acetylcholinesterase (Torpedo californica), 1064 residues
Amino acid sequence: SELLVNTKSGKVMGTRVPVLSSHISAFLGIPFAEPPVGNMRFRRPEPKKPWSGVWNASTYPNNCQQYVDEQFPGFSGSEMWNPNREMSEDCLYLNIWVPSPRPKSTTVMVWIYGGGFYSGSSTLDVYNGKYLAYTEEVVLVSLSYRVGAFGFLALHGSQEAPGNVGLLDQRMALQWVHDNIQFFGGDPKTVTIFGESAGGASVGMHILSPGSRDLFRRAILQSGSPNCPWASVSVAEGRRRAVELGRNLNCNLNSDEELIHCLREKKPQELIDVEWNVLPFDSIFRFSFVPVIDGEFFPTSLESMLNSGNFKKTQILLGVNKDEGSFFLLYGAPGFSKDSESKISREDFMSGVKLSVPHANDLGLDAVTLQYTDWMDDNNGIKNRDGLDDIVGDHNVICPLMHFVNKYTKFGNGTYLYFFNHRASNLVWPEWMGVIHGYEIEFVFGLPLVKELNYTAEEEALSRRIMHYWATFAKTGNPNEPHSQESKWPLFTTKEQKFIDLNTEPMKVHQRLRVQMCVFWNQFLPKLLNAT
Amino acid sequence: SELLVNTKSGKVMGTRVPVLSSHISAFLGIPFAEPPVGNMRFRRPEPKKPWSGVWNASTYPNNCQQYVDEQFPGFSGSEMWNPNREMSEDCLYLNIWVPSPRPKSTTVMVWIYGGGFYSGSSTLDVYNGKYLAYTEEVVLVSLSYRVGAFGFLALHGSQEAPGNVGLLDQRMALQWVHDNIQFFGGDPKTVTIFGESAGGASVGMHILSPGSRDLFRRAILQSGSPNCPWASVSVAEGRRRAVELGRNLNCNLNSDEELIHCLREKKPQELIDVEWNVLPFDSIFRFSFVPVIDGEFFPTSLESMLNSGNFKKTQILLGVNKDEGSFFLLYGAPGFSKDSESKISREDFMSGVKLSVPHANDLGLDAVTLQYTDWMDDNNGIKNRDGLDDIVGDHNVICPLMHFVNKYTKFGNGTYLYFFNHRASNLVWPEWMGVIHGYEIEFVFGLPLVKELNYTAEEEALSRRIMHYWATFAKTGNPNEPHSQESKWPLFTTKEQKFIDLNTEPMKVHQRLRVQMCVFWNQFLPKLLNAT
Ligand SMILES: *[C@@H]1O[C@H](CO)[C@@H](O)[C@H](O)[C@H]1NC(C)=O
Ligand SMILES: *[C@@H]1O[C@H](CO)[C@@H](O)[C@H](O)[C@H]1NC(C)=O
Ligand SMILES: *[C@H]1O[C@H](CO)[C@@H](O)[C@H](O)[C@H]1NC(C)=O
Ligand SMILES: *[C@H]1O[C@H](CO)[C@@H](O)[C@H](O)[C@H]1NC(C)=O
Ligand SMILES: *[C@](C)(O)CCC[N+](C)(C)C
Ligand SMILES: *[C@](C)(O)CCC[N+](C)(C)C
Ligand SMILES: CC(=O)CCC[N+](C)(C)C
Ligand SMILES: CC(=O)CCC[N+](C)(C)C
């Protein structure tokens, strides 16, 4: 049967799924690691023990234990990101959408969900890979990994909670795809990993980590990069947060052994209820448990690795959205609201600046304020609002990504940069948020092809154009069709530094994406805070 | 006789002068202090001893000993500023242009020449006040004062060379005008002092100095302010330069007494030949001997006086030119030339930045560079050139003046701000220099009314409009005609901060003159250099 596949771990029974008045195979909930439960909490993942009989891969697996956003109960804009299936520490599974009839050796794309390393699910509606698998004839795989303390609590030195275990879960999945994807018609030698936000940072981290490089061919990073200020913490900071988490749960803190044992006796939701109490500063776009620069998964500092070229050299495609910072300002900055235009007073602007650059002293804060304030009209509430949006977006996503792309392109084998700036006609979020963080995903996964979702024709066209760029790139290392008559997405070079806009209008090529502001965040500000 | 006037110091015989197919009286070279020669060098000025008989005031007096610009021999653009009469330490004289027939009590305007406190002459062609006196029916007076070491060598504590004696020369002249101007038909109670550059800084310094406040009614400052970074030095810095000047002339440096005696035995040109060797840094727009914050002429720091309102409260009219920095870049910055377009490479830009902000450390220099560099086109030689022009102009003239105006307007009784941006059609300097420092003077003195100078009709109109603004202001404290039908120059207020452009087009009102850049120079940069 086409829905039956035998793998090195055992046999799995898929399920026929309808997609755009057609059908393809879907293998949901395939286990790739032993359930990281009990004394295994915080530990490195163990490979899933082979099973006898047939594994029922007809329905989505559980979602990992995580904080659930209840900021707007019933609101689809926020709940579409929440876990849509029961939560459980037993959540290490992956999903595969296979074209019908089953291919023999077609391109493979592996999706790594974002969510600040504190949340995320591979089962979300917006991540359904049947449209991309069907439309582009690729084997679409979506993995899962532990988030929150469960996947990133870090007590470097200890082996019961070394940290980065969530990254290792991802690797374990990539390893499984490498070893078994062939049986589903996929080519293990043409696997492209791609993810957004923390998933984008994850992708970059696998490009950097020696132990992950050989498990994939190419990479796509969407609004995320390994060097993002929120993507990692030092060994010391990780430890401090783990201890503080223990302090929040009335744990014995005499030793890592005692601390870890206590955290392991606590129920999932217990750790999640106090998770946000460990942050060092009052800030936005900062998450408690994230990857740690341990000297193992990451040999040395990310910056020294990028400088020295200590990373996988291949082709990459990446980009950002126009309004990367609007999302987090709405959730934490004073003066922002979901149902108002959120015009920001100068007082709230100042408060917002301090929340956005937590590690900054007075001089630094002044530097930022000056850089983003129009002193000819400093009380303009819209300019203040949009100003904060740019600060949060430039500081947390765009500039870090631009630093990464410029450093990688030095040793890489081909770079393709994009700037996504189209606002969905059916977006349910307020207009002031613009082209929101993560809203390019629905176009990447082909949602605009489903008439019932109420997208416009032009948007359906953009989605198809994007899906084909991603798929053609994964397959060839170039998003463009060899001898095509359509506009060519130029290669990003150290010299020209070209990129394209991704919207519904005819393609346009630009250069030096956000160069002015990124010189400030990547070169000047760091130097200032360090000198002072 | 109309050309004969008896004053408290004695009688003076003027000379009838033709002006625009007409005539007025001119009293040139009237002494107002004893010749500061011999053992009087570096000393405070002594009032001129009354004389018997008639003093021949028919020809211009000598010019004070000063450095002479020979950078472009034969070139009128530079030589029009050089002394046009024999130099001599015996140079303390003033000139008066009196309307004919002699008025009884008309408005008086006193001109204070600029020249960085190291040069200047009251006899220059561009300073001839016959056009302004004739056209506006005002008594025009132009004083003179010692420049260079002669007027500003400062060894605070000593009474033989206390410093600021050049400022006291100006005051002595103002005192003479106060006591005798009435005999020439002038009203001692309606005297407006005005000057450009160092003359503008001088005007502001008399507004600040308790001992000068009562000697005038109003003030006009052209491209100069008391707080300009080049307008003054500390007691310590002044002393260091005096000692260094002595060191350059092989002087005994065992004591102020010995040092001063030596400097006094040296011939004028001897001190002038080594004058520029005392500057502390490699820099442009910096002069060796300038006013000193002594605790006498200036009670406390200029900034504390401005903050506390410790200054004469009256009405003031002031402004700047569009390209204030081009002049000094041509003379000292690498890459600039008089006969080329002076397109600046990035290397020369960097060199130029360091010459413009001498007191800046690396971080500061980076701050400036970032503030004035277009990172989307950083190799554009024209942008680099014009960028340096703005830096030198903003840092040395505009921003200091904006700080002064905003501080004064707080306690003052009326402020009128202008932005002069018209480039003379007959300017002999290269086009890249734009609206050069000091080229608004010829319009202030009415040169465009002399057909032979080859100005355009529109320019003659602007000159008349400017002359009338200045004269109406000196007379009433408001540049506008009471019930006039012409455009009204709005009053500058703390709230609105309005100003006007001064050119040949119809008047336009703007607000926040150069606010963005001045926030950087007046607030941010100072804070940065101080924190680091
Ligand atoms: C990529 O690598 C191939 C072979 O190593 C080389 O021929 C090609 O020039 C490279 N292309 C880029 C964009 O560096
Ligand atoms: C100037 O002073 C007069 C009298 O002291 C006062 O009536 C007037 O309001 C003042 N004007 C300004 C511009 O401050
Ligand atoms: C898989 O189990 C059986 C087939 O063995 C199938 O009927 C069922 O729907 C699947 N799982 C569920 C939804 O219980
Ligand atoms: C002033 O002196 C006489 C009048 O006493 C006059 O002829 C002469 O021209 C004036 N000074 C000069 C130029 O010698
Ligand atoms: C990224 C910080 O990991 C942000 C995740 C955003 N969503 C939209 C995917 C949840
Ligand atoms: C000011 C520094 O004192 C510059 C004087 C410029 N001129 C044009 C009047 C000589
Ligand atoms: C970005 C986030 O959704 C942060 C959510 C807000 N808390 C930190 C308060 C839970
Ligand atoms: C502004 C000046 O004219 C400076 C002149 C140049 N030297 C300092 C070298 C004499």
